Structure formats: C-alpha cells, structure tokens
Design a protein around this ligand. Sequence first.
Ligand SMILES: [Mg+2]
Ligand SMILES: [Mg+2]
Ligand SMILES: [Mg+2]
Ligand SMILES: [Mg+2]
Ligand SMILES: [Mg+2]
Ligand SMILES: [Mg+2]
Ligand SMILES: [Mg+2]
Ligand SMILES: [Mg+2]
Ligand SMILES: [Mg+2]
Ligand SMILES: [Mg+2]
Ligand SMILES: [Mg+2]
Ligand SMILES: [Mg+2]
Ligand SMILES: [Mg+2]
Ligand SMILES: [Mg+2]
Ligand SMILES: [Mg+2]
Ligand SMILES: [Mg+2]
Ligand SMILES: [Mg+2]
Ligand SMILES: [Mg+2]
Ligand SMILES: [Mg+2]
Ligand SMILES: [Mg+2]
Ligand SMILES: [Mg+2]
Ligand SMILES: [Mg+2]
Ligand SMILES: [Mg+2]
Ligand SMILES: [Mg+2]
Lengths: 207, 257, 153
Amino acid sequence: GISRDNWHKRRKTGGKRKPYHKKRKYELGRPAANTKIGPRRIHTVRVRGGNKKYRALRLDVGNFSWGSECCTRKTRIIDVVYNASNNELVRTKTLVKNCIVLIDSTPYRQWYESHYALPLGRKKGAKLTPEEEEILNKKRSKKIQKKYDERKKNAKISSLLEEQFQQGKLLACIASRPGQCGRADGYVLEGKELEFYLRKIKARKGK
Amino acid sequence: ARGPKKHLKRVAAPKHWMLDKLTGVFAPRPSTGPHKLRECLPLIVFLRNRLKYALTGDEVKKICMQRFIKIDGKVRVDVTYPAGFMDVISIEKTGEHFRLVYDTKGRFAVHRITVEEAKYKLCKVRKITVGVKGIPHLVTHDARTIRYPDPVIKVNDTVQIDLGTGKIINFIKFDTGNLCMVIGGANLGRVGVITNRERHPGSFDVVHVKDANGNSFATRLSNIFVIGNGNKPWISLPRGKGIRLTVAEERDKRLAT
Amino acid sequence: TERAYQKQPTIFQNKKRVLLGETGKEKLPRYYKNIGLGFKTPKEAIEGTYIDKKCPFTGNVSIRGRILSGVVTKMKMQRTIVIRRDYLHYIRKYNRFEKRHKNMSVHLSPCFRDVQIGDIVTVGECRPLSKTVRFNVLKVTKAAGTKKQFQKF
RNA sequence: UCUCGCCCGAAGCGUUUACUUUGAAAAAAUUAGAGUGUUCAAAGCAGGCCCGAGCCGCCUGGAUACCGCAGCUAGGAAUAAUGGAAUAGGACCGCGGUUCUAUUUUGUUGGUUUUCGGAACUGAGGCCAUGAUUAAGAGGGACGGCCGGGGGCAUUCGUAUUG
RNA sequence: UACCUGGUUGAUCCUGCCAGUAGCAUAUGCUUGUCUCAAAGAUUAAGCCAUGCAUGUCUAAGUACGCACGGCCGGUACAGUGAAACUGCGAAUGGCUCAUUAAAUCAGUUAUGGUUCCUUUGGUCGACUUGGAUAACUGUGGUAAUUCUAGAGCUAAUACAUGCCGACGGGCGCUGACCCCCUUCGCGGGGGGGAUGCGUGCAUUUAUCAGAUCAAAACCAACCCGGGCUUUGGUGACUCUAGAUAACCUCGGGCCGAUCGCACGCCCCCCGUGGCGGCGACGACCCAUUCGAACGUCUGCCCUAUCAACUUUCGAUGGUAGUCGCCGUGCCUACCAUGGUGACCACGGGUGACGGGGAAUCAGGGUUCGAUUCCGGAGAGGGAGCCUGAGAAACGGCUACCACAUC
RNA sequence: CGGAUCCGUAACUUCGGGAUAAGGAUUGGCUCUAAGGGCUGGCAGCCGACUUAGAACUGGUGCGGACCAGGGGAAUCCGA
RNA sequence: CCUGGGCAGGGCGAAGCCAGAGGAAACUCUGGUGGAGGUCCGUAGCGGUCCUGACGUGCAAAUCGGUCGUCCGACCUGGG
Ligand SMILES: [Mg+2]
Ligand SMILES: [Mg+2]
Ligand SMILES: [Mg+2]
Ligand SMILES: [Mg+2]
Ligand SMILES: [Mg+2]
Ligand SMILES: [Mg+2]
Ligand SMILES: [Mg+2]
Ligand SMILES: [Mg+2]
Ligand SMILES: [Mg+2]
Ligand SMILES: [Mg+2]
Ligand SMILES: [Mg+2]
Ligand SMILES: [Mg+2]
Ligand SMILES: [Mg+2]
Ligand SMILES: [Mg+2]
Ligand SMILES: [Mg+2]
Ligand SMILES: [Mg+2]
Ligand SMILES: [Mg+2]
Ligand SMILES: [Mg+2]
Ligand SMILES: [Mg+2]
Ligand SMILES: [Mg+2]
Ligand SMILES: [Mg+2]
Ligand SMILES: [Mg+2]
Ligand SMILES: [Mg+2]
Ligand SMILES: [Mg+2]
C-alpha cells in the first residue's frame, strides 16, 4: 500500500493538489528490509515485466575488491561502523549501498604471500607459522621475478594498511545495493578516503 | 488504458489504406512486425481492398492459411500481417511479383516485377552496433539483425538483401548525388536526387532534394530511403519517375486522357 | 575542501606512485567531460577543486532536449538558482500582446563564479534533478553592466 | 582560415529577442473544394470504355486548402528595446620570457633535451582620423530683474457692537 | 442575403430599454400520404435492479485405457471421430457514463543516453529417455441451497521436478621439476623452451587497466635483418557499445530441448543392433524492431478580491548520502541550509467543468455550447488493500468496512 | 480537571484582554545518539556543566503512580 | 506624624533596543532582547466566604478543621 507517487504533493507555490487517482499499480512501494549481519538469507520479489529481485534479509558473505593491487577475494562481514546517512543504522547494523564493513583480513594474506613473498603480520616473532614460507626454495629465475615484484615495485602498502593488517580488520566501502541484488559487493578504502573515514570514526569515538 | 490496444477504428485508421465509412466500424489492425502501424499495409487490405481477389475477408483468411500468399520468400499465416515499404509479394502460381512502392499521392502503388529482380530486395540500415565477442551487428528497418555485415556501412545507408539466403550485397551510402525516395511526411513518395544536407545539433538534420524538370523539396533524415546511384534507380519505379507535377497539370492530363 | 561525507565521482585515486617517496601533485586525477553542442567547457572545471554530482561538466547529467535563456533573480537556494523568462503572448481577439513570465529554478554549477544578479544565462534540458529543477545552467553570456567600475571599499 | 581536397566545399556561426517570407509539422473524421448522372439532391467513394456470351479484359480516382497560438530550419534588416570604447582592464598585426603535454622521425625499447601544436601567466613599443551623435517649440537643475489677497510666526492700526 | 419596425410627447429630435424578426436544440399542442437517411433515459437520480444474455478456445503438430461412435482385424502400445478433464493463451479487450478533476486532464512540440514490455519479425541458441504428485473416472457422502467440497483407488504430460553424453581440449593468466646458449675457476648476470595444479563461455553484481588526428632530431645501455616495422565502431555529448584483469553468480537457484507431427528415402558394415534426417508448432538467457505504457521540457484553460498574502512540526524549497521503485526524482528516511510562489492575480472558493478535433450563429471581428459515435483521461454504489498475470490496485476478480439488498 | 511538554483556541471588546478559554496526545524504567564550553602552542592537544531533542528495548496501559493541585461552558441583574 | 523590620517560587510579556524582509515614501511584517504592573496561580503574613461543620456549663465571656479573598502593595507590623 506504499505509494511513491507524486500526485499527493503541493505545487511550485504550495497549493494542495486535489486527489483523483487510487494509488495505482505502476507506482509500487515495498517495505525496507534491514540487512543484518547474521547467516545468509535471501527472499525473492516479483518485479513488473516478470523480473526477479533478490531481497537480502541478512548476510554473512561479501565480495570486496582491493583497490591498488586489483585483487578480490571472499570476505566474512564482521561489523557495521559509520553509515554516514543515518546513525541509527549503525546500531541496527544494516547493510546499505554506501556503508563501511570490517573485512576479516585473512583471505588477502594468502594472496599477499603467494605474489608478494616475505610477508607481514607476524608481530615480529620470526619463529612461528610453518606455512611453507621457506619450503619451495624459489629455484629458477622466477625468484628474480619475485625480487622485481618485491623490491623494485617495493610493495608499499603504507602504515595505515599496515596497522589494519596487524589489527586484523580492514575498513571497506560497499559499492552495491544489498536490498536490490542481494549482494554486499564493495571495495577497500584506500589512501585519502581511508584516512578521512578513519578520522571520522576516531572523532565519533572521541565525542 | 490498461495494457496494449487491441482494436482499430475505421475513422482512426490512416488515410492511405483507402478504407470506407459505410462498409464497417472496425478497421483491420495490423499485427506486430517490422513496420509501425502508420507506415505499413496489411495483407487483407492488399488482397480484399486493393487487388480485388476476394470480396469478403473470410476468403482472404482462408487462403492465407491455405498457404498461397508468401512475403519475402516464406509463407505468412496471418491475414493482418504488416507489409510496409519495399516488400516483395509473390503468390506461387502466375507472374505476380508486387513491390510496395509509394504512389505520388501517398498510396501504395502496385508494381509487378520480373523474377530476376523479384529475387532481390533493397533495405535501409536503421543502425549499426557491436555485440558478443566483438562482432558487428546491423539493424534494418525491415527488422533484420544481421551479423558480420561490412566495415564501411554508415548508419544511413541502403543495402541490397537477398531473399533466398539473407546475404547482403551492394551497399550505397548517403552522399550528395544519390537518388532517394521520401517515405514519410507531407512529401511521401517524392523521388529526387539528394542535393544538400544540413546538420543540426538537435539530433535531427534536414535534407533538400531536387529532381527532374526543375523542382526541389525538403525532408528529414527519418523519411529518406536511398533508391539509386546518380539518376540510376536500382528498382524500376512505376508510372514514370514518381513525380508530383501540379494539380492543374493532373487536370490537364485528365482532359488529355 | 569538502563539507560532506564523501565526494569521489568516478576517477580512482591511488596510483601508488611511491617508488622512492614523493608527494607530487594530486589535481591530475580529475574527471573532464565534454558536453558537445558546440559550447566551450570553462577552465574552472579544468583547474577547479569542486566535486559536484549534478554538474554538467563533472557529473553524469546529460544535456538534451531544449535550450532556453533567462535572467537570474535569486541566489539564496543552495547550488541552484531561480531564473525569470519574460515573454509575450499573442491574443487572437484583441490582436495584441501581453507580458507573461514563469519563474523556473535551475541548477547553478559552482564552476560558474561571478554569477551576479541580472545576467543573461543559457539553460539546457536534462533529466529531473529534483522536484522543481529540470534545467541546468550551461553558459553565462552577459556581464549585466560594467564590471570595470569600483566604489569605495 | 587554407587547418581537411587563381575559385569552391568545409569549419570558425551568429549581439539576441520582437516582426515578416519559405520549408518541414500533425490524425483521421468535420469545414471550403477536384471528379462522379446515388433517378436530381442530402450522401456515397465510387466508377468508365471495348466485347452479338468468346478482350481466359483494359483505364482512372479515392486530391488539394485551413490546421490558429506554442516549438524547429533557411532568407529579409525598415519598424521598437538591448551592450560594445569613458577612471580604457578596449581593436588588429608584429615581439621578450616562465611552467606543461598528446604523438612522429633518430632500426626497436628504456632515461635526458629542443623545434613543433596549444592552453595558462607576464614586460615594452609602434599602430586606430585612437574611442563620448549636438542638446527636442521634451524634461530636471543653476543664475537674476521681478511678481503674486500663495503659506507660517511675531507685531501694528481701524471704526462699529456689547457692558 | 454588411438590413430593421411599434411604444415616453399637444407635436418634434436624442440617449435609452421593452416588444416584435430569423436560425439553432430540448420539451409540448394540432395534424399526417410516399420514400432515402436518421439522433434517441445526457440534463433531475454516477439512484435501485427482478428476469435472459454479453468470453470462450483443438490443430497431421501438448496430455486420450470415458463406460460414447466404430475401422476389419490380426496382434509386436498407439487406425480415426473423440464427450469430460490436465495444460497454454485471453477475459488488463470491446461496450457504457462523465461523478471527481481548473497547469490537474487534454492539445501542439520535443526524449528516455533516466526504464519495462505479451505477441510478431531476425540473430544467438557449442541418456536407446529419470522421479514422485494429480484431475477427468469408479464406488461412498454431508447439509437448505451456491460455479460447495472432503475422504478411498487409479493413471497421464510442454502441469511440477531431477538430471546425463558429445568435444578436440584449441588458446590465455599464475606457479612449475627440468633443459639450451653467452661470459666468469666457481659465485653471479642476460636471452629462449618446458607436464602436472587452479581457472575457463553469454548474463547477473563488483573493482581496476588500455582505448584517434600532429612531424623533425641529438646523447647513454640492451637486440633483428640487409641503413632500415604494426591498428574495434557510434552519437553534437557518455559513467555508450566492445576487450583484458581477481572472485560471487545468491536453495524463493538466469540460459546451455529428458517435447510433438508429416513425407519416408540413402550409405558403410558381420548383423543395423550405426549414421546421412528435409520441413513445421512451443517459449528458452539476451540483443534490437513492433503494440504500447510511464514519468519528463516549453506554451495554451471559465468565473470570483465580499479569496492579498500562501506553503513549511504531518516536506515547504534545495544540498549531502541512503531506502523503495522498472529506472531520474523530497517518492520516503537521517543531517544541514531557509528557502519556494505572488498585483504579469499565485494561494482560497464555485462551475448547472471531462479536455480537444468540432457544432450553432451568414461582412469582418466576435458570442455561446462540445455528456454524446474519433483521440486521451477517470470510475464501475462510496472508498481502502491484494493474489495471479508481461500488462490491474481489475470489479461480467478477490478480501474487510458503510449504505442497500436475495434465500 | 489539576503538574509539565507538543498542538489548537470562540462569542465579545476600551484591541490591552477574554485565556492555564474550550478540546486532544505523551509522561515509568534501562541502554544509546546529536547539540549547547573553558584552558595551552604558530589547526593540534587536556578538563568538567546539567539542560534540550531524537531512537531502540521492556514492564499485566503502568507511569504528576505518594505528596504538591484551576471542573468547565452559555447567560441575566448590580457594582467599572 | 516620627523612627525601624518584612513579603518563597512560577504565568502574562509594556515602553525602549537589535537583526532580517518588503516599500519610492509613509511606514509595515517577522524573530529575538527587555522586565513594566494599585497584574495573575500561590507560601509566610493580614482578614474571615461557606460547611450556617466541631465546640457551644467549650481550649476560648468568639476558639478550632477543611474550603477560603489578597499577597509589591490604597500591603503587614514593633517602639515613641
Ligand atoms: Mg562515548
Ligand atoms: Mg476501453
Ligand atoms: Mg427580444
Ligand atoms: Mg520529515
Ligand atoms: Mg461535473
Ligand atoms: Mg457564422
Ligand atoms: Mg465569426
Ligand atoms: Mg496521461
Ligand atoms: Mg478502472
Ligand atoms: Mg447504479
Ligand atoms: Mg470490464
Ligand atoms: Mg457563541
Ligand atoms: Mg472566560
Ligand atoms: Mg438588559
Ligand atoms: Mg467592587
Ligand atoms: Mg495585584
Ligand atoms: Mg482570570
Ligand atoms: Mg482564585
Ligand atoms: Mg474561621
Ligand atoms: Mg455553625
Ligand atoms: Mg456537647
Ligand atoms: Mg489561600
Ligand atoms: Mg486557594
Ligand atoms: Mg492573586
């Protein structure tokens, strides 16, 4: 019964428009589904033209793209911080189009080891994690190729992303609509946007 | 109204179908096809009303499903199948190969053609695009979507199409000096050489054309069909070159009889 | 700077230029749209700083349809101004005209600085931006008097 | 302008409305109006010639005119308004310098530099017939010999009336 | 037919109105022979309806063991007609009426590059046949009846579902044991090959990279030849289309034929136990066209000032993000700014107001109607919500309220 | 009825009033969110104030929970 | 008459002043500030409307309990 219509509105001046329609079919309104952080649960919605819409009532998985290095892996959604449109949905933990998700930083560590060897995030222990870190021994000139990847390109992921990898959480921005396509797809906050949202979260925790 | 329309009135019918006011209430609504309702001509109008092959429409409905009348090579089962400009109509028993060219007054002038030209067909390119795996597609106003056409086809060109295989050949471009035929507006059926195009940034460009014995007119790009190459039409057009002389010259021709 | 929550239309920021450590310039990743139509893009959209979603030279707002002209009346509405279009209406009975005008609101792009009240502005049709805004400011033509003059303080 | 093939296409193209002349512009019916002996006519979109039935037939119409007002295009420059150059921050041509980049030849790639193409800024000089239509039997203002029971304030005089 | 006449006065002239004059379309009175057309419960009551109808549908081509008719008819399912059902399509059309509605609806003109789209038209379509369920049908019933239905048995498929083979693996990305050449005593540097393992195609949802107008050299290091070489299209405009890069592709799961009919021939082989199958019906992921729908731009509408300020806590105007929606949107939400309209008549009322193309009225100019056969809108007593469906807030669909109203 | 907050308030008039007019909604507990400042260095950092508004959850509709505390309206006569 | 003492808190929001908007002018509209008054609800104080309540050989030869009018003043009150 929700009408997104525009015939119940005032004019340029503010004169009340007289009603004569009966809230027709081509001006539907469906209720909002606040996408929680629980398990995966998606219902269906019939759309005019026979189309199908995927309403995500609650989600656990996500697909988030790393910015600079162009990598994208699976992600468990952890926590909802700083909606920046309505602060009630931060406490409600509702996934919207422009929101911030804490990526569990585990599925990027395997790619960073596999392409950007001598990795980080080992809290300067240098004795743990028998990973196969030093087993394949890097026989041929692809060792030299990884040396070009590691020291000539120099792999600078400067200290903001260093501290986020040490904490194990990665601040990311959603880029898709969770209530429309049923997907919490997004990208990783990088650089100036990263420090801007970090400053906003720090000031919100401060005041 | 709710959904699409379903009937058509004789009064709301277009003028170029030569329909009556006393014969019936409803007009034959053409089915969906390659041509819009204002620029098409149904088979029941082509048979019952124009050529006078059957008096009633039920006989036309019987013969079009008794598989006599075919359009562009294949048989159409619909009595109200749309057939617009430049469509080859042949029925299988005698020499009857009709071309749906436009009369000078705007009607559908009949034109019986020899089989060696009835095998072929011209058609105007509507647009050109690229599709899956980087292949070129061409959309025709005859609702022909063909792949791998050619690289040197402008959007407003005219390409000869084969009816037996669906193969394109003999593209002619929109150039100053090509014989065109106007297919819409107030000057439809006008045959003339393209003289001067004038472009405009408002997504619609105008074209002044000239024809023989010193006459010139103007039209728009949505109503231009290139038919020839320098006073050499690829399709023979009936009743002279298809020229509107003057109403007074028409009266003088009727007095000369 | 910015006084909102996020301003980044299309251009990806981080090239990760740091191979030995340098700051450099950051005004190079800027989106630059040509509107066509034979109308010159101003240099404020070239060496500017603003980020606008509804800008005809920065945002995805396409210019189509009609092109009209008016005179600017007010500035008090945020990032969009109200213009006035005086015209005459022919009347068949009395066989002469009368003045009519319809005030329209139009999205003033922030690249068009020095947009003082009284200047003849060119507007173009676009998609519906808001409830009463449909046009978009395209080119400011007239200086609306002598800008050469200067008063005390 | 000769940037793309001694002239032209082409692009810079319009200071912009008001007004006119074209041209597209729309959907029919209706209105004026073409043809037609529906027995004339209101209508209708029909019908007409040859053939003793035997030409397994031919020919033609079903147009045009209006469609204001609003919108689009191409010509017209009289009529009515609008800014150009007044504290010159103007107009052309020719000069000095700073920063930057798209792509081509040095056989190719990688690093450096210039001419070139242009945007951005800046200094001097030459050049214009260098730039302001004169002041309406329009108006505002100024000067000065007046003029008026014009207005305000203060003063002065005159009988008469009453006591 | 560019038209008047009588009436104030004892009489005359003038302003002035009244009354005659003539169409038009409603009613009514009197009268009426032929014939061609011909509007016709609009005005008050968009008030109430008894009764009868107005939406059904089968091809050689979806499913036929009906107990119905019967081909010659023997048997290795099915000759054919085939009532009734299951399935798909349409019932969102047509007809009726003008009650609401005064920049609202409509009319002229422009675009969706800001969306969807039944059907048709073309492209794309790269396990010798599986599983339950059920109607019609047979017997058994209930009530006062309805287009009411239960429980027992049965069977079907293009209703539902599940799911296999082909097809060589082409080519590419990342790791990749090992191998060749040149130099150095080895260490070391450069160039060139090479199986396993993860991926792979179109769409969905992300993020990134490369993507056209412009020609002449000079220094330093590596390598090919005999001083010398390399590329999608369109718009006036793209965040358009098209490529490459890493992953999801969502159990309410995009596609990649477990379908039917006609004509019946051909080839190899040890047998056909294998192929060669020509044409037609179904939508099937997507792309365009077509029937449209939808919100958009400008301009245009009757009277009233005894309607001069209106709108804004229950968005009024704009911005920032988000939600919903088919998408562009104060359509909705949180924050921020205080806006927006009006004497060029907004706002507030009435219309015996659906808007036009049109109709009547004979100089020109105008005036008054247009419910009415065409187009577009609105509603099916008032008014709200919704399944199905591509398309409805549908009413010869449903659900609940009010006023009626049948057994 | 009574306090407080948010709406909305007539006849009449000396235009001041009438008015706390009339008539409605909320009021508890517990978590939060936003806003309202000072002091140092040439925008960054340390320290406290009880106020307002909004949201969720919950208790047997219970919330001025005791106490504190205007029933109201239409009129007539007289005295301002 | 002289000389001293005292009157808790809230409501209404006058003059004056500031800012914004309109108008050619006269001036008008809106949002604040301000705290005026023989002003309102109300305590102490001062009087005593009603229950014609209690008492009524009483606490009292005039008192008590509620309900009361007014409480910045034409206010209450000590001493000379
Ligand atoms: Mg805190
Ligand atoms: Mg209908
Ligand atoms: Mg009369
Ligand atoms: Mg709100
Ligand atoms: Mg009405
Ligand atoms: Mg007339
Ligand atoms: Mg007239
Ligand atoms: Mg509409
Ligand atoms: Mg309806
Ligand atoms: Mg009724
Ligand atoms: Mg119906
Ligand atoms: Mg009263
Ligand atoms: Mg009172
Ligand atoms: Mg009295
Ligand atoms: Mg008294
Ligand atoms: Mg008092
Ligand atoms: Mg009182
Ligand atoms: Mg009192
Ligand atoms: Mg007492
Ligand atoms: Mg007593
Ligand atoms: Mg006693
Ligand atoms: Mg008291
Ligand atoms: Mg009291
Ligand atoms: Mg008092």
